């Protein structure tokens, strides 16, 4: 169970590498015994060609012990340590060290080796990674962490806001629907790939292992362009009208009002503040409209001519065109 879903996540890992050259593995067990799929992956992960000469055409085992003698040898040049394996092991498909080979290469190569933007392991490097991002939910493992949906969710909008926009509003029963949500949006968006499945990585039985395998891949995300994000909070989706924002028709000491519309701007307060052509700064008197505080009032009172600049703010951020230009 907790290996069943390790394979399948292992094998896609392997084939995200792999479909660089134009390879695939269908089945792990067997796939990477004549050593030629075993070799590409290693040029691909070390950026390396192999230095042997191999068989192109291994037909019997002797000539696939010997492909896969060149990869071990190439490994332990690398200095990649291997836990407990031979040549047969790989040829003859003991599927429970050949597992252990693909993580010792995931643990490597996509963990422990890249740099990202202590005396640390791999695995608390990642989670320190991971919980930086996810700063609202205690992230302490890859298992039940995991499992209602909604931290893959947090995840994503963190990498780009407005791809999860509303992870935090999310219905925890529905854990499948939340993940593959999260995981497409990242597919799509991040250019991360799916080598484990939604259902797999909030299966009870899921193992740490296959979890860290596809988070491994959000620290070399990137956003694609034309993504289309909708953030939680956007300043530029308030807007301001009235005419105590209008360049001109205010007059020298009447009170200047005008209207704040933030029902699209998500959480936040406004506030605003008056600069005079002497360079005073004033905060004008913000009031909502409402209950609902949708719609805030403003009003300040000119009290000198000239060029006055009005700065909107919501959640300290300028709305649409502010500041705005008002001449008394």
């Given at each position: 169970?907790?290996?069943?879903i ?11 590498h792999?479909?660089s050259v134009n390879?695939?593995?269908?089945n ?8 030629l799929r ?6 691909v992960?070390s950026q ?9 055409r291994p037909?019997?085992?002797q ?12 490994l332990?040049?690398?200095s990649?340590?291997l836990?407990?394996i031979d040549s ?6 003991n599927?429970k060290?050949?597992?252990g080979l693909?993580?010792?290469?995931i643990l490597?190569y ?9 005396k640390?392991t791999?695995?608390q490097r990642?989670?320190?990674?991971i ?7 205690p992230?302490?493992?890859?298992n039940?962490?995991?499992?209602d949906?909604k931290?893959?969710g947090?995840?994503v909008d963190?990498?780009?806001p407005?791809?999860?926009?509303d ?5 925890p029963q529905?854990?499948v629907?939340?993940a593959?949500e999260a995981m497409?949006?990242?597919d799509?968006w991040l ?6 499945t939604?259902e ?7 193992d740490?292992?296959?979890?860290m395998?596809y988070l491994s891949?959000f620290p070399?995300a ?9 953030p939680?909070?956007n ?7 009235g005419r105590?924002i209008?360049?001109?028709g205010?007059?020298?000491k009447?009170p200047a009002?005008f209207?704040?519309d933030?029902?699209s701007?998500?959480q936040?307060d406004v506030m605003?503040f008056?600069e ?9 008197q913000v009031?909502?409209?409402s209950?609902?505080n949708k719609?805030?009032?403003?009003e300040?009172?000119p009290?000198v001519?000239g ?7 919501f ?5 649409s065109?502010?500041?705005f230009?008002?001449s008394?």
């Amino acid at each position: 169970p907790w290996k069943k879903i390790q394979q399948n996540t292992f094998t896609r890992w392997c084939n995200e590498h792999l479909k660089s050259v134009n390879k695939r593995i269908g089945n792990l067990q067997t796939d990477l015994s004549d050593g030629l799929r075993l070799i590409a992956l290693l040029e691909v992960l070390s950026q390396k060609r192999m230095y042997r000469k191999y068989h192109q055409r291994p037909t019997f085992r002797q000539m696939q012990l010997e492909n896969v003698s060149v990869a071990l040898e190439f490994l332990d040049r690398e200095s990649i340590k291997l836990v407990s394996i031979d040549s047969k092991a790989i040829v003859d498909g003991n599927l429970k060290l050949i597992l252990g080979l693909v993580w010792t290469l995931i643990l490597h190569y996509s963990i422990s080796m890249p740099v990202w933007e202590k005396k640390q392991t791999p695995k608390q490097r990642l989670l320190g990674w991971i919980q930086n991002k996810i700063p609202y939910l205690p992230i302490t493992n890859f298992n039940q962490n995991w499992q209602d949906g909604k931290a893959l969710g947090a995840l994503v909008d963190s990498c780009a806001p407005g791809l999860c926009p509303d992870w935090e509003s999310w219905d925890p029963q529905k854990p499948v629907d939340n993940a593959r949500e999260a995981m497409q949006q990242a597919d799509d968006w991040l250019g991360v790939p799916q080598v484990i499945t939604p259902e797999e990585i909030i299966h009870p039985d899921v193992d740490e292992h296959s979890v860290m395998t596809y988070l491994s891949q959000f620290p070399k995300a990137k956003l694609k362009p034309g993504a289309p994000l909708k953030p939680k909070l956007n300043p530029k989706k308030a807007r301001a009208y009235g005419r105590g924002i209008e360049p001109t028709g205010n007059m020298v000491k009447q009170p200047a009002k005008f209207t704040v519309d933030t029902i699209s701007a998500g959480q936040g307060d406004v506030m605003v503040f008056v600069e005079d052509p002497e360079g005073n700064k004033e905060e004008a008197q913000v009031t909502p409209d409402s209950d609902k505080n949708k719609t805030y009032s403003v009003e300040y009172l000119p009290k000198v001519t000239g060029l006055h600049k009005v700065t909107v703010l919501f959640a300290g951020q300028h709305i649409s065109k502010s500041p705005f230009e008002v001449s008394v």
